[PDB]
Design an enzyme around this catalytic site. Structure first.
Site, PDB file in Angstrom:
ATOM      1  N   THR A  16      18.914  -3.186   4.450  1.00 39.75           N
ATOM      2  CA  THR A  16      19.162  -3.312   3.100  1.00 39.75           C
ATOM      3  C   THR A  16      18.708  -4.816   2.645  1.00 39.75           C
ATOM      4  O   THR A  16      18.651  -5.310   1.329  1.00 39.75           O
ATOM      5  CB  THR A  16      20.547  -3.373   2.700  1.00 39.75           C
ATOM      6  OG1 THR A  16      21.397  -4.063   3.561  1.00 39.75           O
ATOM      7  CG2 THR A  16      20.847  -1.918   2.742  1.00 39.75           C
ATOM      8  N   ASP A  39      -9.106   6.913  11.557  1.00 40.01           N
ATOM      9  CA  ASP A  39      -9.370   5.536  11.614  1.00 40.01           C
ATOM     10  C   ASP A  39     -10.427   5.212  12.587  1.00 40.01           C
ATOM     11  O   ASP A  39     -11.193   6.062  12.628  1.00 40.01           O
ATOM     12  CB  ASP A  39      -8.025   4.684  11.648  1.00 40.01           C
ATOM     13  CG  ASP A  39      -8.045   3.278  11.198  1.00 40.01           C
ATOM     14  OD1 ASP A  39      -7.113   3.000  10.332  1.00 40.01           O
ATOM     15  OD2 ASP A  39      -8.860   2.490  11.910  1.00 40.01           O
ATOM     16  N   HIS A  69      -8.645  -1.606  14.746  1.00 35.22           N
ATOM     17  CA  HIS A  69      -7.806  -1.498  13.520  1.00 35.22           C
ATOM     18  C   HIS A  69      -6.988  -0.247  14.124  1.00 35.22           C
ATOM     19  O   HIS A  69      -5.981  -0.150  13.441  1.00 35.22           O
ATOM     20  CB  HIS A  69      -8.775  -1.361  12.593  1.00 35.22           C
ATOM     21  CG  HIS A  69      -8.377  -1.239  11.134  1.00 35.22           C
ATOM     22  ND1 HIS A  69      -8.092   0.255  10.785  1.00 35.22           N
ATOM     23  CD2 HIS A  69      -7.875  -1.967  10.243  1.00 35.22           C
ATOM     24  CE1 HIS A  69      -7.491   0.209   9.364  1.00 35.22           C
ATOM     25  NE2 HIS A  69      -7.561  -1.110   8.962  1.00 35.22           N
ATOM     26  N   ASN A 161      -6.679  -3.432  -0.792  1.00 35.51           N
ATOM     27  CA  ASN A 161      -6.600  -4.951  -0.617  1.00 35.51           C
ATOM     28  C   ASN A 161      -7.251  -5.749  -1.594  1.00 35.51           C
ATOM     29  O   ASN A 161      -7.685  -6.884  -1.245  1.00 35.51           O
ATOM     30  CB  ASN A 161      -6.840  -5.270   0.666  1.00 35.51           C
ATOM     31  CG  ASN A 161      -6.161  -4.528   1.786  1.00 35.51           C
ATOM     32  OD1 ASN A 161      -5.290  -4.313   1.497  1.00 35.51           O
ATOM     33  ND2 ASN A 161      -6.855  -4.274   2.672  1.00 35.51           N
ATOM     34  N   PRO A 175      -3.300  11.546  -6.829  1.00 35.41           N
ATOM     35  CA  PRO A 175      -1.600  11.720  -7.262  1.00 35.41           C
ATOM     36  C   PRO A 175      -0.836  12.355  -6.300  1.00 35.41           C
ATOM     37  O   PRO A 175       0.233  11.967  -5.905  1.00 35.41           O
ATOM     38  CB  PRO A 175      -1.500  12.408  -8.479  1.00 35.41           C
ATOM     39  CG  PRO A 175      -3.024  11.985  -9.385  1.00 35.41           C
ATOM     40  CD  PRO A 175      -4.002  12.114  -8.190  1.00 35.41           C
ATOM     41  N   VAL A 177      -0.805  12.595  -3.009  1.00 36.53           N
ATOM     42  CA  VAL A 177      -0.547  11.791  -1.653  1.00 36.53           C
ATOM     43  C   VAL A 177       0.313  10.533  -1.896  1.00 36.53           C
ATOM     44  O   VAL A 177       0.882  10.347  -2.985  1.00 36.53           O
ATOM     45  CB  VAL A 177      -1.833  11.449  -0.865  1.00 36.53           C
ATOM     46  CG1 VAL A 177      -2.733  12.857  -0.686  1.00 36.53           C
ATOM     47  CG2 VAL A 177      -2.558  10.496  -1.781  1.00 36.53           C
ATOM     48  N   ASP A 200       3.253   4.758  -4.861  1.00 36.55           N
ATOM     49  CA  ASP A 200       4.449   5.511  -4.713  1.00 36.55           C
ATOM     50  C   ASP A 200       5.626   4.602  -3.943  1.00 36.55           C
ATOM     51  O   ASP A 200       6.874   4.887  -3.980  1.00 36.55           O
ATOM     52  CB  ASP A 200       4.253   6.962  -3.714  1.00 36.55           C
ATOM     53  CG  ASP A 200       3.462   7.802  -4.308  1.00 36.55           C
ATOM     54  OD1 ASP A 200       3.910   8.241  -5.513  1.00 36.55           O
ATOM     55  OD2 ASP A 200       2.290   7.958  -4.054  1.00 36.55           O
ATOM     56  N   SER A 224      -3.383  -1.517   4.817  1.00 36.75           N
ATOM     57  CA  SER A 224      -3.782  -0.726   6.309  1.00 36.75           C
ATOM     58  C   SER A 224      -2.404  -1.066   7.154  1.00 36.75           C
ATOM     59  O   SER A 224      -2.257  -0.047   8.060  1.00 36.75           O
ATOM     60  CB  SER A 224      -4.811  -1.176   7.021  1.00 36.75           C
ATOM     61  OG  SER A 224      -6.201  -0.745   6.366  1.00 36.75           O
ATOM     62  N   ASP A 260      14.095  -4.933  -4.782  1.00 36.93           N
ATOM     63  CA  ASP A 260      14.260  -6.024  -4.032  1.00 36.93           C
ATOM     64  C   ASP A 260      12.963  -6.682  -3.941  1.00 36.93           C
ATOM     65  O   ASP A 260      13.060  -8.036  -3.444  1.00 36.93           O
ATOM     66  CB  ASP A 260      14.483  -5.520  -2.487  1.00 36.93           C
ATOM     67  CG  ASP A 260      15.795  -4.742  -2.314  1.00 36.93           C
ATOM     68  OD1 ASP A 260      16.577  -5.287  -3.251  1.00 36.93           O
ATOM     69  OD2 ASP A 260      16.069  -4.254  -1.468  1.00 36.93           O
TER      70      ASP A 260
END
Length: 277
Positions: A16, A39, A69, A161, A175, A177, A200, A224, A260
């Site tokens: 938390t 990837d 990566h 990014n 939308p 995913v 999301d 990523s 937060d």
């Protein structure tokens, strides 16, 4: 279960509050789930994968991760030390070359591959796909991600990014995913993270330690790196029976730490992935 001196992002996902270093999770650890890492490949012999990683497809002359990566992202999903879901099965789909680049037609083929290939795998607890990649807006790329999700796979995608609205990037802008932004260890939006209404959820994305090629490890930053935290979390929650592939993004948002994060633009969710363990 408790993992002391964990990477900060693992500790963050089970807390938390920021500023702790132990990752707490149910020992089931995503057993019986599967995560596709779409990837540059996965160095599956890395000791950190413990035999739970395998390549299932490449579009290039080799299935080797010559970049790092994909290995790093796979490690955040499911490596023993650096992973969220430490008992999941990892499947590598190499749609990106060793320079980290890939044509959209290859990326689309890889998404449709996963939608079918899950029928060749044993994933009784459910299937996730982690897409730490993207480029400019493409309706065809978004449609491929939508099909993958519709087929019964929890699709988690990087927001990008560009420190810009993710509506102009794909598959981030699809939308249906789960579009993942990045945060840092002080609960600030990462400086590079895209934002906007299409996001999301946020996950840890600045200074993330994970596996690398040559049997090594390193810390890198990006959306990523945030995406595989959410993918691994989904697998973990599906193993616990708390949610399903079709509902996991919504469930993660519903159960997230709320309010937060700092430097969240007006109109972007202030939700940080949290396992509620």
């Amino acid at each position: 279960a408790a993992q002391t001196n964990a990477p900060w992002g693992l500790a963050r996902i089970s807390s938390t509050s920021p500023g702790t270093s132990t990752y707490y999770y149910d020992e089931s650890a995503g057993q019986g789930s599967c995560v596709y890492v779409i990837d540059t490949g996965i160095e599956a012999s890395h000791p950190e994968f413990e035999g739970r990683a395998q390549m299932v497809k490449t579009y290039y002359y080799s299935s080797r991760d010559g970049n790092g990566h994909g290995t790093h992202c796979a490690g955040t999903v499911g490596s023993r030390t650096y992973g969220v879901a430490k008992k999941t099965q990892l499947f590598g789909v190499k749609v990106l070359d060793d320079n980290g680049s890939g044509q959209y037609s290859t990326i689309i083929a890889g998404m449709d591959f996963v939608a079918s290939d899950k029928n060749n795998r044993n994933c009784p607890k459910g299937v996730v796909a982690s897409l730490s990649l993207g480029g400019g807006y493409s309706s065809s790329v978004n449609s491929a991600a939508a099909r993958l999700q519709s087929s019964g796979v929890m699709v988690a995608v990087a927001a990008g990014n560009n420190n810009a609205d993710a509506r102009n990037y794909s598959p981030a802008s699809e939308p249906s995913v789960c579009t993942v932004g990045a945060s840092d260890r002080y609960d600030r939006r990462s400086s590079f993270s895209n934002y906007g209404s299409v996001l999301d959820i946020f996950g840890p994305g600045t200074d993330i330690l994970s596996t690398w090629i040559g049997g090594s490890t390193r810390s890198i930053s990006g959306t990523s790196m945030a995406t595989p935290h959410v993918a691994g979390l989904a697998a973990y929650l599906m193993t616990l029976g708390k949610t399903t592939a079709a509902s996991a993004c919504r469930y993660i948002a519903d159960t997230a730490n709320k309010g937060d994060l700092s430097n969240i633009p007006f109109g972007t969710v202030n939700l940080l992935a949290y396992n509620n363990y």
